[PDB]
């Protein structure tokens, strides 16, 4: 079985890139034919981004000498601008003109999960319906190959032109293949502009040094493919052969030496004996009507029957095989099957909350690992455009210029899915302890709750004043 | 059973007959060929007085408009039990795939199919421009003789009178016979394509060999055609004014192989003679309900359920290619 | 089975280095083909570093005579500088220009887990986008071999040039092999500069004296390889042979002596008997249509059948074999399988919290053992650069110079993953007891909570004043 | 002992026989060649009536389907005791490495190996298209004569009757003999590759030397093939219509060297003749349990423990290349 799937013995990058197309193609096959990939990407979406992905700008006020109040007001301005620019209802923020920021993050994270890499391009849109002429078009991974599909070279390696030190200079984007009859032409695309401008945002997780591509799926999913095939076929055979039945006719006849002599005489010159016996047996079956049930017994003149003696008859064991292996690959691939297909077998209280909190912290890990890159890159490009357009005003006491301290000025964090609910009592006792001991700040409280302290305080002011005015109890 | 669109060849390499003399394709929504329906040559001289204009001009009613196209529908199996044509070392792991083996074997099967219909069409072409008669025939089918109308002066023979074999191999010049047969051809002749031994006794005359120019002197796209089909058309060279070619194509019949060309024959005519490719109805329910009743060819891949529970590739066509002017070529049997 | 894997009887270093390439290559094979290594490295990442790795500078104020307040303010300055330098959004802190500090620690810890060693190099970047011209390029372990792949020598031993006493002087870095056709050339690299500058940070855990390389994985994982193979093959055979069926035809015939005499006469000169019988049986099967189901019974003229008598039919036992061995190697390799593939079988409350606290303390062990080295080395290099650039001001009353007391001045600790959550009630009763009895300090409280006392106090001030101003309840 | 993947050459430079006439590779999972199993030429003419379709068409049952492939498995040692081929001054320090010496010496060893099997395959090819007979023979092995079926008119001799040596060196033209031998070749001949002295007495006739065109007049990719293998194939030039080539390849046998070609021989045929490369089973446990029972070649590097405690490179193959149409080439021994 190791024949149809073969690992070379070498560093992972040189063991994957030669068989990149086959592994990725069979990955496409399984993610299309199989529901597990859809469920996994959907849960990753709903744990990492969830409803939305919220920007929070925190310029390094302490290091830059900027006042915290000026930083906070400038952040208010940039947050209002960014939310109003992102909430465009006409899907107009993409060059394809059919994806908002939500689906920017969606397709980016999905493709960085599947192929391990995502490709964003900051292009200059001309549609004047918005103040900001920068859109972000996502680039397929099929596009990145060496110019004219040539094999890897000295410095042109699977489509990326690098130096001897590996520094990613640029890329050869092959032309799109949709419809299925466009030819591919390779075009030069630099990774970033010299001034720090993020033109081609290439975010991938390298497992080792010098690696150019991300992680796969199929190269650990062939075994589900062939287990589902084998369980499927074995259930089919079991079902079809629980009551397969042979309906033949035998007789006494069979006078050993006499039967053999009759057969030999028929073979030599006395076939009339066989013809007469066949006629008698045909008359037998047409005067009997030899019929078993609703159907006719298949015509068998005496002396021939099937021997449907069977193989071993122990239990198939597939039960504990499949539970063990589903277990196995479930906290292999990472998301547990007791919800990837939802068993409720013997699961208990500590079971539930321990599994939930470890899995949720681990999704927080993946979120902070493979979402903040895209978030910061897009925010940096948008903030550069805003500074170009003088939408928001930089602090006058800027210790470093915007172009010099884009990292310092464009320092930001992002908020993923909403408020976690698992037990209730858990979150509420945590909340009461934090609010009584002061062990929670504005920033981490809002991180835990998916809200904002400024708005909760303003709305509590509104709550109290409306209760006082209408006669309610604050 | 794979879709209709899996019919990509980009391999059209017919031997200069259906591509150069017989470009004039007419697939119909109707069974037969109706030469009255084809405009063919248009009544193309008369004008009208400078006061008003005249009557309505039609397709000028061809006298004979009823012949049976050769509706050819063969098939084969592409059963994934063979080891296939393995192009050198392009990853036989995909051949190990039943999917890739089945798709490139339907590729191979269907290409055999259209080259089969092409070779039978070339036999039709060689019958057509060698005698003006074509035998629309087959078992469980009446033999219809389809005649373009080749005239007697287009069938005059070299053996009549004095033979080139029965002539001086050194001083006699067959050019005199060349214009003798070319004059009654209703046009200019610019290819003298022979069958092999026909060209052999043609060139046996010295006058031929010091009259012919072996040089390229590239006249037209015929050199490009020979470079394309370097198989059985052989550009001997220039005879000065006219091009000298030899066709040695062969058809591999049921148990044996033999050349398309007879022993010693010639057709004198132009490279731009008008050739009709009338095509009949395609008797396939798929073809009718998707409108391929009027087309060239039709492939399909399809599964039989039941007794012959298998899967096949089926090719259907109905050509009745002929020549518009049978008098355009003079057909001569040689010495 | 001991044939394809062979231990010599000798000290571990001389028992591993001769078979270094084979063991490491099969380790690559299993970490690429198998999901367990990916899950283990991911959990090690999320337990050791987690979200981030936080620096805290504590110069030995008491020993150096430095005031604690001056030390704390100087630490504030260096922490602001280090966070703003580390938060670079363009991935520009590496020579490869594609990894931030997070992935510095990520690749370092991953490679120090796999090969037991990590190789960092402090190089002088020329990119002027940042104030600090020092980057840190990580060096592959394949690079360290003797000059031109020569075998171990007197003092040149597997690429490291040492003395008789073993002191690691320098290294022979072979040239990179990506693309797969660069030749290797060996270049000299000293371990550290004489002035204490950390040029080539070589952090590895030696199991014994004189050992040069770290620990492996495959040399304890071959047994998972071959158990997964054997369980896979045995499930395949079980599935395919639960209903394998022989469909032959026998008859009565068989007149012993007569049949033998007929066969002998056929062998000698009377093959016409066999031809006649074969014709009769062919007519038999073509006049019967001997057909069992949807398929034709394979053509068997009488007198020959398969004897598919089986082997023993006891239960395979693989169930308790595999549970025992998964158990076994699970708290062998160290991380328990009841989460490396997530069983919830009969697991209880004391089960959960005892296992969780012991495993988490043990990850705290690994963190403090294999992360603080890299953290301190990188911090020392960065602080040396900062002192060169006069970014932060050393205390004026320095009892020892910076170059003399780099260890004393550059004394630091680091914070790994965020706030542990397992039970809730546990952490909250611990917190209330510590805050009532005063049994927790600033430093260990912030270690337990993943926060900072200064910022929690400042934000509590902000909390109270905003509640007072807006009308809320402090 | 190094892995299977250390078998990278990108050096396929066979002398225009196994690459141009004998492209038709058929490696099998079965020992012998089963010409009935190979489809070869397909029964390729008949259609069916425009009512229903006919029977099922098969591989048309080759009459003889049992010959023994030349299972050749040689080996060598790559013992790191030699100084090797030192390409000029690419850092002999890596040669000083046992690792680099051993890997590039297995490179050298194995390349010698496939060029050995290639040269024995070329001897098989020259036997095949020079007499239609091949001697599947070796010590401790029965000599099987594998015959494609070359006909008598494909073995007619120039010395019979009048010899070119026994002719006028100035006025006689051997072109007449050229078409005389080409006519019974079942196709057109477009290469007249000679052995050296054969071409010598061919060109000794003046008519040849003022009939041939020394110019390029680049006809096909044969000039590219000569530029590639500038070793032993020599593109003399154009003879006008046909290309003139000379093969002077040599095999270096056990103690001596001698040319592949006999003294004075010729084969008249096409450049697109069909050549089969049927390949037998590969008798190597590695090959069977990884599925290389049906392939071209198999290398391996492997250590023997015990009496011959050493390490070797082993190459295994099983070619039985033949020609589909032995009648395609007329084989003539010259004056």
Cα–Cα distance for residue pair D19/D17, rounded to 1 Å: 5
A-chain residue closest to C114, CA distance: A208
- Chain C, nearest residue to D8 by Cα: C181
Q: Name the burial class of residue D263, with classes exposed (0-12), middle (13-18) and buried (19+) by CB atoms within 10 angstroms of its CB.
A: exposed
| Residue B24, CB-side half-sphere exposure with 13 Å CA sphere | 18
Q: What angle do CA C58, C60, C66 make, to 5 degrees?
A: 105
Q: For residue B141, what are its two tokens?
A: 């089918």
Decide if B290 contacts B38 (C-beta within 8 A).
no
Cβ atoms of B192 and B244 within 8 Å: the answer is yes
CA dist A6 and A29 (Å) reads 18
Alpha-carbon gap, residue C228 to C217, rounded angstroms: 17
Task: Quote the tokens at residue A145.
Answer: 């190959």
* Residues D193, D196, D202, D207, CA torsion sign: positive
Shortest CA distance from A2: residue in chain D: D290
- Tell me which residue of D287, D261, D299 sits closest to D112, measured CA to CA: D299
Q: Touching check for C150 and chain D: CB below 8 Å? A: yes
Write the secondary structure of chain B as one string of H (helix), E (strand) and C (coil). CCCCCCCCCCCCCCCCCCCCCCCEEEECCCCCECCCCCCCCCCCCCCCCCCCCCCCCCCCCCCCCCECCCCECCEEECCCCCCCCCCCCCCCHHHHCHHHHHHHHHHHHHHHHHHHHHHHHHHHHHHHHHHCEEEEEECCEEEEEEECCCCCCCCCCCCCCCCCCCCCCCCCCCHHHHHHHHHCCCCCCCECCECHHHHHHHHCCHHHHHHCECCCCCCCCHHHHHHHCCCCEEEEEECCCCEEEEECCEEECCCCEEECCCCCEEEECCCCCCEEEEECCCCCHHHHHCCCCCCCEEEEEEEECCCCCEEEEEEEECECCEECCHHHCEEEECC
As a whole number of angstroms, the distance between CA D12 and CA D228 comes to 10
Work out the minimum CA distance from A449 to partner chain D, whole angstroms. Answer: 56
Neighbouring residues of A337: CB distance < 8 A, sequence distance ≥ 6? A326, A327, A330, A343, C342
Cα(C390)–Cα(C377) distance, rounded to whole angstroms? 20
Residue of D93, D95, D103, D104 to mutate, interface with C, max C Cβ within 10 Å: D93
- Tokens 């170009």 -> residue: A388
N-terminal to C-terminal alpha carbon distance within chain C? 71
What is the C-alpha separation between B118 and B107, in angstroms, rounded?
A: 16
Calculate the CA dihedral of residues D290, D292, D297, D299 and round it to 10 degrees.
10
CATH number at residue B199: 3.30.1930.10
Q: Residue D329's CB: how many other CB atoms inside 10 A?
A: 27
Spacing of C-alpha D121 from chain mean position: 5
Task: Give me the residue label for tokens 């979120």.
Answer: A367
Q: Which residues of C286-297 are buried (b: 16+ CB within 10 A; e: fewer)?
A: eebebebeeeeb
Per DSSP, the residues of D62-113 read -S---B----B--EEE--TTS-----TTS-THHHHSHHHHHHHHHHHHHHHH
Give CA angle at C346 (C341, C349), nearest 5°: 95
Q: How many CB atoms lie within 10 A of CB D279?
A: 23
Q: Which residues of B23-39 are buried (b: 16+ CB within 10 A; e: fewer)?
A: ebebbbeebbbbbbbbe
Residue A117, φ and ψ in degrees, nearest 5: -140, 155
What is the C-alpha to C-alpha distance for residues C67 and C397, in angstroms, rounded to an integer?
9
Contacts of A186 (CB under 8 A, 6+ apart): A145, A146, A147, A148, A159, A172, A173, A174, A175
* Min Cα separation A4/chain D (Å): 10
Which pair of tokens denotes residue B246?
Answer: 């030899």
Q: Which residue has the tokens 């897009």?
A: A378
Element (H, E) at D143: strand D141-147
Sign of CA dihedral A236, A241, A247, A252: positive
Instruction: Return the closest-CA partner of residue C214 out of C136, C141, C105.
Output: C141
Omega before residue C179 within 30° of 0, cis: yes
Cα distances (Å, whole numbers) of residue D55 to A40, B72, B114, B309: 52, 14, 19, 14
- Count CB neighbours of D168 within 10 A: 11
Residue B12's nearest CA partner among B191, B225, B219 is B225
The shortest C-alpha distance from D33 to chain C (Å) reads 27
Residues D2 and D106: their CA atoms lie apart, in Å, by 9
- In Å, the largest CA–CA distance within chain B is 79
Query: Residue C161 pairs with which residues in a beta bridge?
Result: C156, C170
- Encoding tokens for residue D120? 């024995």
Q: What is the sign, positive or negative, of the torsion defined by CA atoms of A158, A164, A165, A171?
A: negative
Q: Walk across the sheet containing D24-27 and list its strands.
A: D24-27, D275-279, D322-323
Contact B230 D190 (CB under 8 A): yes
Is A103 in a helix, a strand, or coil? helix
Strands (DSSP E) found in C281-375: none
Q: Report helix, strand or coil for A168.
A: strand
Q: Are B243 and B267 in contact (CB under 8 A)?
A: no
Whether residues D290 and A3 touch (CB distance < 8 A) is answered with yes
Spell out the SS3 assignment of B27-59. ECCCCCECCCCCCCCCCCCCCCCCCCCCCCCCC
Q: Name the nearest CA neighbour of B185 among B147, B161, B149, B153.
A: B153
Quote the CA–CA distance of D108 and A168 in Å, as a whole number: 36
**How far apart are the CA of D313 and the nearest CA of chain C, in angstroms?**
20
Q: Which of B238, B235, B237, B282 is nearest to B73 (CA)?
A: B282
Q: Which two tokens stand for residue C453?
A: 């006392």
CB B17, CB B46: distance < 8 Å: no
Examine residue A179 and say whether the peptide bond preceding it is cis (omega within 30 degrees of 0).
Answer: yes
CB proximity under 8 Å: A 263-302 to C: 263-264, 266-268, 271, 274, 278, 298-301
All residues of chain A having their beta carbon less than 8 Å from the beta carbon of residue C237 are: none
3-class DSSP state for residue A24?
Answer: helix
Helix (H, G, I), strand (E, B) or coil at C120: strand
d(CA B317, CA D47): 10
Residue B258 exposed, middle or buried by CB count within 10 Å (0-12, 13-18, 19+) = exposed
Rounded to whole angstroms, the Cα distance separating C405 from C407 reads 5
Contact status, residue B268 vs residue B185, Cβ threshold 8 Å: yes
d(CA A60, CA A407): 9
Nearest residue to B23 (alpha-carbon basis) of B327, B261, B324? B324
Answer positive or negative: Cα dihedral of A29, D29, D316, D273. Answer: negative
Write out the two tokens for D49. Answer: 């009536």
- Resolution of the entry in angstroms: 5.6
Rounded distance, CA B119 to CA B182, Å?
28
- Coil, helix or strand for A272? helix
DSSP H stretches of helix in A249-348: 257-268, 271-287, 318-333, 337-340
φ and ψ at residue B67, rounded to 5 degrees: -140, 155
> Which one-letter DSSP state was computed for residue C115?
T
Q: Within 10 A of A390 (CB to CB), how many other CB atoms are there?
A: 8
Q: Are C317 and A313 in contact (CB under 8 A)?
A: no
Please name which of C68, A49, C254 lies closest in space to residue A41, comparing C-alpha atoms: A49
Say whether residue A1 is in contact with chain D using an 8 A CB cutoff.
no
Q: Which chain D residues are closer than 8 Å to A8 by Cβ?
A: 5
Chain D CB within 8 Å of residue C233 CB: no
- Can you give the residue range of the structural domain that contains D167? 152-274+326-333
Helix axes A20-33, A35-48, angle to 10 degrees: 90
> Which tokens in the block code for residue B74?
């063969």
Contacts of B91 in chain D (CB under 8 A): none
Largest CA distance in chain C: 121
**Shortest CA distance from D292: residue in chain A:** A3
- At D144, list the tokens: 């099987």
CB contact under 8 A, A8 and D291: no
Q: How many CA atoms lie within 13 A of D229 on its CB side?
A: 21
Provide, as residue numbers in chain C, all residues whose Cβ is less than 8 Å from the Cβ of D95: none
DSSP, res A160: E
User: What is the 8-class DSSP label of residue A166?
Assistant: -
As a whole number of angstroms, the distance between CA C333 and CA C217 comes to 9
Three-state SS at C171 = strand
Q: Terminal CA-to-CA distance of chain D, rounded, Å?
A: 54
Burial class (CB in 10 A: 0-12, 13-18, 19+), D80: middle
Distance, in Å, from the CA atom of A70 to the CA atom of B92, rounded to the nearest integer, reads 68
Helix/strand/coil for C284: helix
Provide the pairing of β-strand C160-162 with C168-173.
antiparallel
* Cα separation, B320 vs B318, whole angstroms: 7
Does C242 contact A244 at a Cβ distance shorter than 8 Å?
Answer: no
**Is there a contact between A3 and D5 if contact means CB atoms under 8 Å apart?**
no
A305 token code pair = 């029957």
Check if the beta carbon of residue A93 is closer than 8 Å to that of residue A138.
Answer: no
| Cα distances (Å, whole numbers) of residue A100 to A42, A104, C36, C117 | 18, 6, 37, 45
Interstrand relation of B24-27 and B275-279 (parallel, antiparallel or unpaired)? parallel
What letter would DSSP give residue A155? S
């Amino acid at each position: 079985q190791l024949r149809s799937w073969n690992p070379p013995s070498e560093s992972v990058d040189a063991a994957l890139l030669p068989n990149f197309t086959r592994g990725n193609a069979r990955a496409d096959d399984l993610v299309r034919n199989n529901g597990y990939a859809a469920n996994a990407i959907q849960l990753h979406q709903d744990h990492i981004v969830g409803s939305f992905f919220r920007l929070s700008h925190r310029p390094s006020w302490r290091y830059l000498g900027i006042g915290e109040e000026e930083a906070r007001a400038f952040s208010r301005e940039v947050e209002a601008a960014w939310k109003e620019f992102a909430e465009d209802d006409c899907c107009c923020i993409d060059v394809e003109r059919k994806r908002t920021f939500t689906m920017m993050i969606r397709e980016g994270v999905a493709m960085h999960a599947f192929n391990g890499e995502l490709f964003v391009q900051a292009t200059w849109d001309t549609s004047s319906s918005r103040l900001f002429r920068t859109q972000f078009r996502m680039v397929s991974p099929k596009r990145i190959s060496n110019p004219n599909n040539t094999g890897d070279s000295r410095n042109c390696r699977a489509g990326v032109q690098i130096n001897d030190s590996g520094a990613a200079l640029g890329y050869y984007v092959s032309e799109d293949g949709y419809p299925g009859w466009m030819p591919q032409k390779w075009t030069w695309i630099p990774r970033e502009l010299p001034g720090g401008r993020a033109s081609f945002i290439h975010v991938f997780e390298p497992v080792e040094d010098g690696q150019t591509r991300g992680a796969n799926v199929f190269y650990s999913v062939m075994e589900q493919m062939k287990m589902l095939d084998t369980l499927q076929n074995t259930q089919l055979q079991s079902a079809i052969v629980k009551a397969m039945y042979a309906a033949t006719i035998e007789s006494e006849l069979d006078t050993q030496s006499a039967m053999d002599f009759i057969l030999g005489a028929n073979s030599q010159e006395q076939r009339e004996r066989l013809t007469g016996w066949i006629g008698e047996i045909a008359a037998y079956y047409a005067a009997a009507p030899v019929r078993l049930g609703g159907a006719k017994v298949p015509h068998l003149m005496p002396g021939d029957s099937l021997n449907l003696q069977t193989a071993q008859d122990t239990d198939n064991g597939y039960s504990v095989f499949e539970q063990s292996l589903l277990r196995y690959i479930a906290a292999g691939l990472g998301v547990s099957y007791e919800q990837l297909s939802r068993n409720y077998a013997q699961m208990s209280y500590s079971t539930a909350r321990a599994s939930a909190n470890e899995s949720w912290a681990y999704f927080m890990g993946r979120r902070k690992f493979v979402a903040s890159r895209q978030a910061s890159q897009m925010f940096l490009c948008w903030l550069e455009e805003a500074i170009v357009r003088r939408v928001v005003t930089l602090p006058s006491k800027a210790r470093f210029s915007f172009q010099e301290a884009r990292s310092a000025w464009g320092n930001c964090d992002w908020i993923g899915s909403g408020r976690m609910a698992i037990d209730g009592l858990k979150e509420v006792q945590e909340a009461v302890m934090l609010i009584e001991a002061g062990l929670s700040t504005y920033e981490k409280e809002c991180a835990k709750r998916g809200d904002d302290y400024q708005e909760i305080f303003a709305q509590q002011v509104r709550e109290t004043m409306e209760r006082r005015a209408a006669g309610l109890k604050p | 059973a794979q879709l209709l669109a899996a019919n990509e060849q980009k391999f059209k390499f017919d031997p200069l007959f259906l591509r150069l003399f017989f470009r004039e394709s007419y697939p119909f929504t109707t069974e037969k060929v109706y030469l009255s329906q084809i405009p063919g040559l248009v009544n193309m001289a008369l004008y009208v007085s400078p006061i008003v204009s005249g009557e309505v001009i039609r397709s000028r009613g061809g006298s004979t408009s009823e012949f049976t196209p050769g509706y050819v529908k063969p098939k084969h199996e592409v059963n994934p039990q063979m080891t296939l044509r393995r192009l050198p070392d392009e990853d036989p792991q995909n051949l190990a795939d039943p999917a890739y083996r089945r798709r490139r074997i339907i590729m191979q099967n269907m290409r055999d199919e259209e080259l089969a219909i092409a070779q039978v069409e070339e036999m039709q072409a060689v019958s057509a421009v060698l005698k003006g008669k074509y035998t629309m025939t087959g078992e469980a089918f009446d033999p219809v003789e389809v005649d373009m109308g080749r005239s007697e002066e287009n069938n005059i023979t070299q053996s009549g009178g004095t033979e080139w074999s029965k002539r001086d191999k050194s001083t006699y010049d067959p050019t005199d016979d060349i214009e003798a047969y070319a004059l009654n051809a209703s046009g200019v002749v610019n290819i003298i394509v022979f069958d092999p031994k026909g060209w052999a006794l043609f060139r046996s005359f010295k006058a031929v060999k010091e009259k012919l120019d072996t040089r390229r002197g590239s006249n037209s796209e015929l050199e490009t055609a020979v470079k394309d089909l370097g198989k059985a058309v052989s550009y001997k060279g220039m005879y000065g004014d006219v091009a000298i070619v030899v066709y040695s194509g062969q058809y591999v019949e049921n148990g044996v192989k033999k050349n398309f060309l007879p022993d010693n024959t010639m057709v004198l005519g132009n490279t731009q003679a008008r050739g009709l490719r009338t095509y009949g109805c395609i008797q396939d329910a798929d073809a009718q309900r998707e409108g391929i009743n009027a087309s060239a060819r039709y492939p399909k891949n399809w599964v039989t359920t039941g007794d012959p529970a298998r899967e096949f590739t089926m090719i259907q066509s109905a050509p009745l290619m002929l020549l518009a002017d049978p008098d355009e070529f003079v057909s001569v049997q040689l010495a």
